[PDB]
Amino acid sequence: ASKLRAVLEKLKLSRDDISTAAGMVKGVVDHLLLRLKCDSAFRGVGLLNTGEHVKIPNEFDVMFKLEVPRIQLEEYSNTRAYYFVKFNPLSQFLEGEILSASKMLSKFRKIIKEEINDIKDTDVIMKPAVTLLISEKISVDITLALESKSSWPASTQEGLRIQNWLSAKVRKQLRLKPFYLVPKQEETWRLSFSHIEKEILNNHGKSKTCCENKEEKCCRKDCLKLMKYLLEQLKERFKDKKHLDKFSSYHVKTAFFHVCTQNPQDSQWDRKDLGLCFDNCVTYFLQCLRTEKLENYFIPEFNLFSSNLIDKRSKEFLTKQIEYERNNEFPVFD
Ligand SMILES: [Zn+2]
């Protein structure tokens, strides 16, 4: 309780520094926004949202969207999340009727690499996305996404189980918004709902006025922040072995969404209960590791904790560490 509020207070001390690390990212991103818009295949390129951190802070995430009419999806080998694209200026990227991720992605690179070599002032360099490093500290991941305005694919029909939490009316309204395809067969694309993830986090209560007044302060955002921070701290400490580096804040974010579904009432996230809500988040994540199952929140048959993605040994390792931390009141938080 008191230890975790001290952690949150420390994290806030870093906020008047993102304000200068994110401001520098953004100006490099609008500079590419223009050059892409000058290429004939990336003319309807824009930004998705305003406008994410995997490290919470030197990793920054920006997604470039791109409207593509006449979309058509073919599910790669009933993997639920991976698709080929079929149907214009994008005809240069197709290999036999289907849209080639690797071709479209590889010209994305050339155009950006052509540009970071022309910003002579700031020392930006290049190193599922393209990673830039602005002036030796803060990097950014730039992801290209295709936008489709059609109904969501069949593998999402049982996902986004927010009915008992955010209501069926909101689930209806969210599923009319577009969805996105990100390049990972190497010509396959992966569903992305980053835009929905952000909206659910910022409009996160059963009560429409959750966190808009002093009588309704939940600790939902503070639990996700602690969870992401727990993982970051553990990865730093276990860097002599580096067998935690398959895990990412997106696993924590997904697990936190499942816990929101389990604890749908704002009274289960009362700020006074920070210690117990955080514990709820950690034990669920723990169960995900021990069962080797972490369902993508939108695609239930897509297991992020598969053996394909993360081997058994790494999950066993993180289990033993999180288990020890939870049974000892998180000494990793000092
Ligand atoms: Zn709230």
Residue numbers in the entry: 162 to 212, 216 to 220, 223 to 253, 260 to 299, 306 to 362, 371 to 520
Task: Pull text from the paper.
Cyclic GMP-AMP (cGAMP) synthase (cGAS) is essential for the host defense against cytosolic double-stranded (ds)DNA arising from various maladies (e.g., pathogen invasion, ionizing irradiation, and genotoxic chemicals).
To further examine these discrepancies, we crystallized and solved the structure of the catalytic domain of human cGAS (hcGAScat). We noted that, unlike the mouse enzyme, the three β-sheets do not move upon dsDNA binding, while the catalytic residues assume different rotamer conformations. However, the activation loop in our structure was mostly disordered (thus not modeled in Fig. 1D and Supplementary Fig. 1A). Together, our observations suggest that, instead of being fixed into a specific autoinhibited conformation, the active site of resting cGAS assumes an array of inactive states and its activation entails a dsDNA-dependent disorder-to-order transition.
